[PDB]
Copies of this chain bind each other. A is one copy, B any other.
């Protein structure tokens, strides 16, 4: 029997088809163009570091789909097709926003400090690629930890909360903000795949719980290192804050990131 209708990832796959119909081509970015045009040069430089982090972050999950297919986990692989399609819309949405406000050509990589690179240039592609040649429990937990629990479950979740804190209130960038709420919803499913994947391996052998915690801790310094750097950039050129009577509470944001991290650790149980 080809499919287990009761399998959690099969149920997550059904959910993905029903809830992941959004199309980035349907979003109206015209107001966003005006909003970015109305900004001052200084203000313009304010918003770009946060948007740089998202525009780099090619289907990172591809190796995972390959490895789980090879192990015969058909339901996981079905679900992963929706994940990879979500990644495609992700890239599409930011590229349309960038083109709509005229920073399509601009090289935002300058807002990737070293800590960012330690995550997005090394730990993530390395941990995913590994799975082509080594699909051990450790390897899989590591790939799920870095991508699902850290990149998505911590940084992405915190960047989405940040965009809303700043701009939903500013009245700015209604197209981006709609894109972000769709991304955020897609990502709920991604995090559940990660949790399901880590938990099933931990269930098998409690030693893998320590490995999960250890690897969340080893990545923490670069997560907080990138947040400080953005934080510092922000504080240092917050003309946008002055202009839009915004309270960019960087101390709040920072605590939101910490809370995401501890919350992810907490969704994996030793038993």
Contacts and interface: CB of A to CB of B under 8 A. Distances in A.
**Identical chains bound together, number:** 2
Q: Chain A interface mostly helix, strand, loop or mixed?
A: helix
Interface stretch (A83-91, A194-202, A203-211, A233-241): A83-91
Interface in A216-242: none
Chain A interface residue bracket vs B: 35 or more
Contacts of A43: none
Interface string A51-93: 0000100110010011001000010011001101101100110
A266 interface: no
Interface stretch (A16-24, A165-173, A176-184): A16-24
B58 A62 contact: no
Interface of A: 1-3, 5, 13-14, 17-18, 21, 23, 25, 55, 58-59, 62, 65-66, 69, 74, 77-78, 81-82, 84-85, 87-88, 91-92, 94-95, 98-99, 104-105, 132
9 contacts: A2-B95, A2-B104, A58-B69, A59-B81, A62-B62, A62-B65, A78-B92, A84-B84, A85-B85
